[PDB]
Amino acid sequence: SYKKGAASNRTKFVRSLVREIAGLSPYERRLIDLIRNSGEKRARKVAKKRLGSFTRAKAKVEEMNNIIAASRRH
């Protein structure tokens, strides 16, 4: 590899700001509601159905969990 590159933390900062300002999509809202009430076992199925890729569903679930942790723990 010669051009894979890294985030440099600028893309990270911009993406975090965009995630905070934009809010949560209705499907994202349902996913977080299921996580906070049902759990991963129920949220991952919905994520896969909405997306169709298991890896993408797992990544979205992890992102939602991180957002919930950053929000409720402050």
Binding site: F13, L17, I21, A22
Partner: protein
């Protein structure tokens, strides 16, 4: 209704604070085309027959202002509340808050453009100020903070 990010604007500064801010900004009007042209012609004439300090002006370019922010160089930022592509300015208040740079929302982009010899200026920010106005700049920053962050602490809430 509108989401919390929308309606954050339109909660502008009061009459007195906005008037004071515009009065301060009017002391740093960037030289227009004619003024710069005449200054350059005078300099050329002086050079023809045979050390100034850094000029002070208000930074207003949207890209330029955004570049100034996120580097903590900017001290005051003015944001227009009537930008037709709202997406160009939705992120500015939150970015300024994250960076800690004081910011304010003023009524009308044409008002910002007038103080910078432009038809419409999306934003207007100050980076460096003269020592004489440094105390005035700090006082205006404190007044803006008190009247915006505390008075409108709920601006980011209640849709």
């Amino acid at each position: 209704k509108v989401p919390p990010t929308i309606a954050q604007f339109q909660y502008t500064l009061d009459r007195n604070t906005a008037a004071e801010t515009f009065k301060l900004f009017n002391k740093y009007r960037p030289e227009t085309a004619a003024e710069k042209k005449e200054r350059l012609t005078k300099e050329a004439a002086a050079v023809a027959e045979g050390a100034s300090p850094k000029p002070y002006a208000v930074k207003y370019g949207l890209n330029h202002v955004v570049a100034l922010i996120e580097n903590k160089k900017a001290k005051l930022v003015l944001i227009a509340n009537d930008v037709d592509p709202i997406e160009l300015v939705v992120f500015l208040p939150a970015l300024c808050k994250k960076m800690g740079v004081p910011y304010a929302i003023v009524k009308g982009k044409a008002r910002l453009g007038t103080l910078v010899n432009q038809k419409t200026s999306a934003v207007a920010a100050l980076t460096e100020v003269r020592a004489e106005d440094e105390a005035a700049l700090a006082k205006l920053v404190s007044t803006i903070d008190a009247n915006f962050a505390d008075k409108y602490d709920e601006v980011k809430k209640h849709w």
